[PDB]
Design a protein around this ligand. Structure first.
Ligand SMILES: CCCCCCCCCCCCCCCCCC(=O)OC[C@H](COP(=O)([O-])OCC(O)COP(=O)([O-])OC[C@@H](COC(=O)CCCCCCCCCCCCCCCCC)OC(=O)CCCCCCCCCCCCCCCCC)OC(=O)CCCCCCCCCCCCCCCCC
Ligand SMILES: CCCCCCCCCCCCCCCCCC(=O)OC[C@H](COP(=O)([O-])OCC[N+](C)(C)C)OC(=O)CCCCCCCCCCCCCCCCC
Ligand SMILES: CCCCCCCCCCCCCCCCCC(=O)OC[C@H](COP(=O)(O)OCCN)OC(=O)CCCCCCCCCCCCCCCCC
Ligand code: SF4
Ligand code: SF4
Ligand code: SF4
Ligand code: SF4
Ligand code: SF4
Ligand SMILES: [K+]
Ligand SMILES: [Zn+2]
Lengths: 114, 176, 386, 145, 206, 94, 38, 154, 143, 94
């Protein structure tokens, strides 16, 4: 269990980078909504940032966390430098996807998928 | 072995220096370029009068697909699926069963002409000269759906073009 | 200020689309950041789901101005792993059409370079020559561009009777067409103002940045894979390698024009030295048998059946095989796992490393020069993006 | 084997034999390996198959017009190395390279024979045995097949 | 023999001798040296040795591999380190090619070789994009081939051929949208491998 | 081919060449579009004897790589230094 | 210098696979049965 | 009444099919055959199809090559900026329906998922003549338009 | 220069006077006179002139009516029947008047041009029959 | 041997035809159903049986290399003809 680190030597070092990235994303959302003329609000944008961060909250490997931050920074750079277009930003919200059934009965009626 | 494309010393004698000054001030090499375009103005153009005149093609030309018959009218295809196996684009779809007379024949033979890369591997693979690429290239359509050929369309193509297809195969089959 | 170049010119252009994000200060270019992948089509992944024969047409569509040369590179790599050898007549045909392909590429490279700089007329003259060469492609393969003609083991079919006479008639007049092109450009002071001392690259930098082909020889490096690592029958033809002295766009343009002349010189020898014989390896476990044999002999039918369904198995191994393609070193890192489908196929496109050097080469130049530098690299985004 | 032929003569051709609705015989393809004969006698306990004639004319069959209708008869399709014995229900419907194999279990009896279900484009194409030494070896019954 | 590729024992011997040469000079990093039957030399090294080994091959007077022909990766899921990093180098001085290979997994970074070859810049961006291998100290590491916001690394063996999402234009939102992939015709998987062994010389022990 | 003699002189003078000798348009010098049938040769494995496949099996002559060193005197270069190229005698300078 | 990681190796969050195709799929690990036809 | 509307339709249809200014999206190898249609042998200019046309001056978009996901939003944007009437010609298998790269993760399976298409030109690539046949087919499509006839009967 | 003008006048006479000369000028944008090679059953007329350069040495003057369609102004390449398609595209040197195609009973006696965008356009469909047969409940209330 | 179903839709040579309540026949409204009229099963049945002298005959479909792979047909059975498995031509021993 001896491995080469990416950036952080432990979880505490890794969590510092996570918080720094959250700060950058949090401050960027108002500019993104304006630059891309999004129809979503700033609260919706910041809620989306929180949801994406929360889904990875269970990780305990500092190397995995480093990669998640590395990828999150890349995503932020794409947004700030406006390499993304309006469609790329809005892909986080899945507006044209119909809600998919969650409970057993709804899934049972519509198909065979679990 | 190599050669230099641009390793030359301009002469610095007065006569040569004055040749370059004359070129600079009197635009001689620009005039020369005007001579070339003027000569082309008086050349016969290379344009042909399409669709009354057509570009030349060879018997090997790979155009629209067709399914062929024997002289008796029986289909050549015996549903071996070699064309479907080799197709680099997976453009061919085949189903088969015993025909009412016991023959081994297809019940489905589809070519998605928008998946096809018009490579001719199917006609190379076919062991009985059943699927060929014909000489036709003027079959553009107004809808996507019209380019999803089923077996009836491909057999109709064979019956439509067999006169030309047979002669082209006669011309090239000794190279195969 | 920040600026984005347009995807492509407002006239027909066949290089693909590029998103160039640039940083400018006044007229000068300070940073170039090409954003590619606009023609990325996952070719390298698709090949893993194909037999070796099924993957061959993908190479026509990489540098789709140099079709048969890309076919040759892939064929040589598979022949090496197969440990077989194509017959001598096929090798001569491959060199003959390799140089016809070089002419096709250099016409496109030189004339569209000129067309983007504003010199429209030569494109029209020389594309009539390209149209006649498309006819040679069509007469051997039935296709004007994506012939799929050169295959591991040799070529698909022998030349039709009368083709070599027509290639001779074409070649007889082509140098005159080059001369007319040089009359328009070589000594033109406007052309020289757009190219001389533009995009200079040192010999040392060109090597470290991964350059190849004319991008090396323009800087004086004496290197050509047809000379140093010959393949097929290139060791049996005589030709000179043009070498630049200034390492700029003008010298690279002169190198490409002179290479066209040397290609005619090679084609001349190929037309006279063409030997008789079969045109694909006489091993029916690799190359399919003749149709008459397939319809008469039990062994031939089996091998035809198996070669067109499973395909031939290739012994396990990995090779990096490269050729002197018209745009530079074109290679394939081909990994075989012993089956009839390649395990991995990395494609080395010469334009990939050339375009990566656009930022280096454009330093200290103006916006209009960026167009000239892209042209001198001769970039096609099918091979860059794959 | 070699990659070419040097056989310059005409080929033999034999007449086909009707042995029932499950097994189609194209006996010109037979290579006289006698696997079917040995299977019928030893595994199935049915001494109906043999060889008639001699030399190049030796023919596998029943001699008289007879049906090989045993509950294990369909297994001769698998053991025949060539297309001399083929499944009549399956005829012409698929090629092996395009089928997807689902390893499954048979429910037609309580033996639990291990099977492979061959499917193509969402359709069941045939049933093959799956080797299991402790249950069905490499055979299945005709109802299972 | 007209159909058989001829051998070249002279080059096989030269490359073998140079293979030992490199192994003797870099024993800290070199794990294996082999020469293929078609005369290609491969140096298999520990990943820590990327910069020392590449620098040596570039700058040593008996090597002078000044040109990086290609840098790529191969995914072999059955290996503990599934990724194999392959450097194809060329020496114009000695008219020779060498191949250097190392390995890594999903979470272990590899040192960027941009300091040795400027050519490596984009090759490493492509490896990161297509395989997800991280290169330490890379000046500008980011996707290069895939679309912005693309998730996953498509050249991994376990990434599906058609991916997970596909695009279309939606009139209601007046933009191109991304949705889970559905195919009118599923790609038809073929089982092509013959059940009979083809090459005895490569048989693995039971 | 059908240009008047005056027009031939004008475009010859303007271009500075004898264009009429190398016209870019093809006339009757090209091959006929119907040719006699070919009779193509056969390869060297088309023999009735002394032709066993195991004597001409290239694929089966391939071997796994030779292992020179596994982790299980004069210096050398990967090959002799490349020989300096010669100037063309056909035309050294453009 | 190396670090110490005692976590079980898990890369689900960095593979880009949708959750539906991680949590509801059942992988089957097997040696394919010999095709009984050969 | 109906006679005057019928002839006005003929006049405007004639003008539009006689002056087709194309915006070419030269995406991949199909663009090469498009260049050969502009080249002297076919000279599309002789039909009134100009060589160089700005996207805001264009009447027809020719999609000549593979459309990737990365490129699809930019192609739609150019189409949306085209002044009407506007037509789209899909050239080649890739543009028609994905072609050789149909099963790729990065490729749009036909440009008709992004823009309406008027003419599909088959081939990989279609020959320059096959493309010219497609453009001539679009001209006859414009000839059949009855815009004023429909408007009069509203 | 006078001989060029004479050849210009010869074309007017060679197209049956001014009316015929103007007709071909506006239908075909070309007034060249060639040798008549033949006419197919639909009315297309095929001409050759081997003094023209390769490409312009063969051409077809399309019929004014084909399969009930007025093709005086609307012509297209798909109107050439297959037996002439080979000759017109220089896939062969012999016209069907000298090398007629082999007759087969199944070959279309009537060529059809591109039918896209008309009520005769091709419409794809699945040519296979139903796979799974459903159980039909009894038509009586025995329950 | 085309025949029209009760709804008037032609049946193909593969027996396909949309049934009464199948919405999919809406695709043919205002257009047509492409059906090839030359049913191969009917055309091969018009060929006469070929009378031959030998017990074994070979067929390659005619045209030499332009036909199908050459196969040999046993004619011992007198209750039926020998049928070519590629082209459907029939033979009988006289
Ligand atoms: C305002 C000015 C314009 C109005 C004045 C009109 C001038 C008379 C034009 C008559 C041209 C008719 C030619 C002809 O008979 O057609 C032959 C043609 C058949 O001939 P052919 O078999 O193809 O052979 C042609 C030659 O072999 C191949 O062609 P070729 O090039 O070898 O020879 C054709 C001939 C045609 O020359 C002319 O007739 C025009 C001469 C006046 C030039 C005006 C400028 O050229 C010459 O003979 C050369 C001498 C003429 C003087 C050339 C001077 C060039 C400039 C000098 C260099 C300086 C550059 C700066 O028949 C036609 O197709 C008739 C088409 C009619 C087209 C319209 C022409 C009229 C122009 C419009 C008039 C107003 C309305
Ligand atoms: C302001 C005055 C406008 C003058 C209108 C000029 C119309 C000329 C014209 O239509 O050409 C004949 C056109 C030419 O026919 P065409 O354009 O369909 O095809 C000609 C033949 N090809 C294309 C093969 C070369 O005749 C017509 O098609 C009828 C359209 C008449 C439009 C005029 C409306 C009144
Ligand atoms: C214009 C029509 C085309 C004329 C044909 C072109 C031509 O023959 O000119 C070439 C001639 C040679 O010039 P060049 O080859 O460049 O060598 C240096 C100078 N001897 O170069 C010349 O002689 C061109 C001389 C041009 C004279 C100056 C024109 C000034 C115009 C205003 C008066
Ligand atoms: S031409 Fe090529 S891509 Fe098209 S159907 Fe035939 S094999 Fe498939
Ligand atoms: S067309 Fe030819 S290759 Fe394809 S299934 Fe039919 S007989 Fe076999
Ligand atoms: S198993 Fe097949 S090949 Fe063997 S004897 Fe029986 S029928 Fe002949
Ligand atoms: S598939 Fe096998 S059994 Fe059938 S004909 Fe071919 S070799 Fe004979
Ligand atoms: S359809 Fe063919 S020629 Fe056109 S872009 Fe695609 S691969 Fe290239
Ligand atoms: K069997
Ligand atoms: Zn037959």
């Amino acid at each position: 269990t001896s491995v080469k680190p990416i950036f952080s030597r432990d979880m505490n070092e890794a969590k510092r980078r996570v918080r720094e990235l959250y700060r950058a994303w949090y401050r960027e959302v108002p500019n993104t909504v304006h630059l891309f003329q999004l129809d979503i609000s700033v609260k919706q944008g910041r809620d989306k940032v929180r949801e994406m961060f929360k889904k990875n909250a269970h990780i305990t490997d500092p190397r995995v966390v480093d990669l998640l931050v590395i990828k999150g920074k890349m995503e932020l750079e794409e947004t700030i430098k406006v390499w993304k277009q309006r469609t790329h930003v809005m892909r986080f919200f899945h507006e044209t996807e119909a809600p998919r059934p969650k409970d057993f009965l709804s899934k049972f009626y519509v198909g065979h998928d679990p | 072995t190599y050669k230099y494309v641009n390793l030359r010393e301009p002469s610095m004698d007065m006569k040569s220096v004055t040749d370059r000054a004359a070129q600079t001030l009197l635009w001689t090499e620009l005039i020369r370029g005007l001579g070339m375009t003027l000569s082309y103005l008086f050349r016969e153009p290379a344009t042909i009068n399409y669709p009354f005149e057509k570009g030349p093609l060879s018997p090997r030309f790979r155009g629209e697909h067709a399914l062929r018959r024997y002289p008796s009218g029986e289909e050549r295809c015996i549903a071996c699926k070699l064309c479907e196996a080799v197709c680099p684009a997976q453009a061919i779809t085949i189903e088969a069963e015993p025909r009412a007379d016991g023959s081994r024949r297809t019940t489905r033979y589809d070519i998605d002409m928008t998946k096809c890369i018009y490579c001719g591997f199917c006609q190379e693979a076919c062991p009985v000269d059943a699927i060929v690429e014909g000489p036709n290239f003027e079959f553009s359509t107004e809808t996507h759906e019209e380019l999803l050929y089923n077996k009836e369309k491909l057999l109709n193509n064979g019956d439509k073009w067999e006169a030309e297809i047979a002669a082209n195969i006669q011309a090239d089959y000794l190279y195969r | 200020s920040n600026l984005t170049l347009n995807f492509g010119p407002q006239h027909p252009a066949a290089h693909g689309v590029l998103r160039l994000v640039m940083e400018l200060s006044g007229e000068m270019v300070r940073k170039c950041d090409p954003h590619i992948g606009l023609l990325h089509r996952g070719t390298e992944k698709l090949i893993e789901y194909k037999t070796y024969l099924q993957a061959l047409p993908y190479f026509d569509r990489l540098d789709y101005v140099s079709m048969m040369c890309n076919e040759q590179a892939y064929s040589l790599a598979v022949e090496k792993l197969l440990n077989i050898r194509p017959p001598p007549r096929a090798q001569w045909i491959r060199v003959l059409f390799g140089e016809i392909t070089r002419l096709l590429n250099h016409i496109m490279a030189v004339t569209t370079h000129a067309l983007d700089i504003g010199a429209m007329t030569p494109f029209f003259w020389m594309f009539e020559e390209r149209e006649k060469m498309f006819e040679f492609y069509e007469r051997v393969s039935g296709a004007r561009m994506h012939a799929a003609y050169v295959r591991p083991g040799g070529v698909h079919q022998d030349l039709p009777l009368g083709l070599m006479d027509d290639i001779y008639e074409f070649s007889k007049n082509f140098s005159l067409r080059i001369d007319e092109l040089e009359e328009m450009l070589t000594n033109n002071r406007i052309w020289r103002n757009r190219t001389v001392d533009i995009g200079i690259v040192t010999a040392e930098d060109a090597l470290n940045y991964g350059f190849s082909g004319v991008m090396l020889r323009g800087s004086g490096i004496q290197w050509d894979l047809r000379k140093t690592q010959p393949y097929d029958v290139y060791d049996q033809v005589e030709f000179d390698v043009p070498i630049g002295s200034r390492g700029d766009c003008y010298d690279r343009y002169l190198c490409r024009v002179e290479e066209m002349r040397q290609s005619i010189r090679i084609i001349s020898q190929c037309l006279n030295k063409m030997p008789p014989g079969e045109i694909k390896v006489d091993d029916a476990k690799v190359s399919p048998p003749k149709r008459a044999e397939m319809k008469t002999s039990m062994e031939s039918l089996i091998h035809h059946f198996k070669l067109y369904t499973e395909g031939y198995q290739v012994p396990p191994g990995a090779t990096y095989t490269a050729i002197e393609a018209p745009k530079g070193e074109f290679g394939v890192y081909l990994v075989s796992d012993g089956s009839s489908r390649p395990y991995r196929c990395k494609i080395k496109a010469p334009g990939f490393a050339h375009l990566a050097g656009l930022d280096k080469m454009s330093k200290g130049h103006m916006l209009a020069d960026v167009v000239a530098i892209i042209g001198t690299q001769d970039i096609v985004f099918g091979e860059v993006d794959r | 084997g070699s990659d070419r032929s040097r056989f310059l003569e005409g080929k033999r051709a034999v007449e086909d034999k009707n042995i029932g609705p499950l097994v189609k015989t194209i006996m010109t393809r037979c290579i006289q390996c006698t696997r079917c004969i040995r299977f019928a006698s030893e595994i199935a306990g049915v001494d109906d198959l043999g060889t008639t004639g001699r030399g190049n004319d030796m023919q596998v069959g029943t001699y008289i017009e007879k049906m090989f209708m045993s509950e294990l008869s369909g297994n001769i399709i698998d053991i025949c190395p060539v297309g001399a014995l083929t499944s009549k229900p399956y005829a012409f419907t698929a090629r092996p390279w395009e089928t997807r194999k689902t390893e499954s279990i048979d429910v037609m009896d309580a033996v639990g024979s291990n099977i492979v279900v061959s499917t193509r484009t969402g359709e069941v194409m045939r049933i093959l045995p799956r080797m299991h030494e402790d249950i069905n070896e490499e055979w299945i019954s005709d109802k299972t097949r | 023999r007209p159909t058989v590729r001829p051998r070249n024992d002279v080059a096989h011997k030269q490359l073998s001798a140079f293979g030992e040469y490199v192994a003797e000079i870099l024993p800290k990093y070199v794990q294996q040296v082999q020469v293929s039957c078609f005369n290609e030399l491969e140096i298999c090294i520990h990943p820590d040795g990327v910069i020392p080994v590449l620098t040596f091959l570039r700058d040593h007077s008996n090597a002078q591999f000044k040109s990086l022909a290609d840098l790529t990766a191969v995914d072999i899921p059955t290996r503990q380190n599934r990724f194999e990093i392959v450097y194809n180098l060329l020496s114009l001085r000695f008219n020779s090619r060498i191949r250097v290979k190392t390995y890594t997994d999903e979470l272990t970074p590899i040192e960027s070789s941009v300091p040795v070859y400027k050519a490596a810049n984009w090759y490493e961006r492509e490896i990161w994009d297509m395989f997800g291998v991280f290169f330490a100290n890379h000046p500008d590491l980011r996707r290069i081939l895939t679309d912005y916001g693309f998730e996953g690394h498509p050249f991994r063996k376990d990434f599906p051929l058609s991916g997970y999402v596909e695009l279309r234009y939606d009139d209601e939102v007046k933009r191109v949208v991304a949705e889970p992939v559905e195919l009118a015709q599923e790609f038809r998987k073929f089982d092509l491998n013959s059940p009979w062994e083809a090459f005895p010389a490569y048989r693995q022990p039971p | 081919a059908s240009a008047t003699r005056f027009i031939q002189w004008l475009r010859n003078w303007a271009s500075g060449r004898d264009l009429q000798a190398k016209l870019q348009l093809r006339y009757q010098e090209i091959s006929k579009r119907t040719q006699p049938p070919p009779k193509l040769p056969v390869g060297p494995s088309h023999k009735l004897s002394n032709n066993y496949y195991c004597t001409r099996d290239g694929r089966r002559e391939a071997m796994p790589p030779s292992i020179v060193m596994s982790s299980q005197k004069k210096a050398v270069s990967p090959a002799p230094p490349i020989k300096r190229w010669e100037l063309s005698q056909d035309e050294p300078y453009l | 210098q190396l670090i110490t990681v005692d976590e079980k190796l898990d890369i689900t969050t960095i593979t880009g696979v949708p959750e539906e195709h991680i949590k509801t799929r059942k992988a089957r690990i097997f040696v394919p049965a010999r095709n009984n036809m050969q | 009444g109906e006679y005057v509307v019928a002839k006005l339709d003929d006049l405007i249809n004639w003008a539009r099919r006689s002056s087709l200014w194309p915006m070419t999206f030269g995406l991949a190898c199909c663009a090469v055959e498009m260049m050969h249609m502009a080249a002297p042998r076919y000279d599309m200019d002789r039909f009134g199809v100009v060589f160089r046309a700005s996207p805001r001056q264009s009447d027809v978009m020719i999609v000549a090559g593979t459309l990737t996901n990365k490129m699809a939003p930019a192609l739609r944007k150019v189409y949306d900026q085209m002044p009407e009437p506007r037509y789209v010609v899909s050239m080649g298998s890739c543009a028609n329906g994905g072609g050789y790269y149909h099963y790729s993760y990065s490729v749009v399976r036909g440009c008709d998922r992004i823009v309406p298409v008027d003419i599909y030109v088959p081939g990989c690539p279609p020959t320059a003549e096959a493309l010219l046949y497609g453009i001539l087919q679009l001209q006859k499509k414009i000839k059949r338009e009855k815009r004023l006839r429909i408007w009069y009967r509203r | 220069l006078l001989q060029v003008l004479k050849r210009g006048l010869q074309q007017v006479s060679g197209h049956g006077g001014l009316r015929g000369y103007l007709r071909v000028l506006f239908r075909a944008n070309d007034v060249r006179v060639g040798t008549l090679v033949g006419e197919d059953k639909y009315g297309n007329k095929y001409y050759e002139d081997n003094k023209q350069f390769f490409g312009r040495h063969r051409w077809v003057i399309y019929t004014t009516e084909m399969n009930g369609k007025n093709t005086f102004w609307d012509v297209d390449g798909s109107m050439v029947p297959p037996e002439w398609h080979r000759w017109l595209h220089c896939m062969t040197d012999d016209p069907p008047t000298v090398k007629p195609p082999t007759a087969r009973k199944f070959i279309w006696t009537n060529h059809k041009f591109n039918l896209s965008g008309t009520p005769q356009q091709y419409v794809p469909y699945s040519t296979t029959r139903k796979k799974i047969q459903e159980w039909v409940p009894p038509s009586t209330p025995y329950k | 041997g085309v025949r029209t179903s009760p709804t008037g839709e032609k049946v193909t040579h593969t027996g396909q035809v949309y049934d009464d309540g199948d919405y999919r026949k809406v695709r043919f409204v205002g257009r047509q159903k492409e059906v090839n009229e030359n049913f191969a099963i009917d055309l091969i049945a018009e060929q006469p049986v070929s009378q031959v002298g030998s017990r074994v005959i070979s067929c390659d479909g005619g045209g030499g290399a332009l036909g199908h792979p050459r196969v040999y047909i046993n004619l011992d059975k007198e209750t039926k003809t020998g049928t070519c498995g590629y082209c459907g031509l029939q033979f009988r021993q006289q």
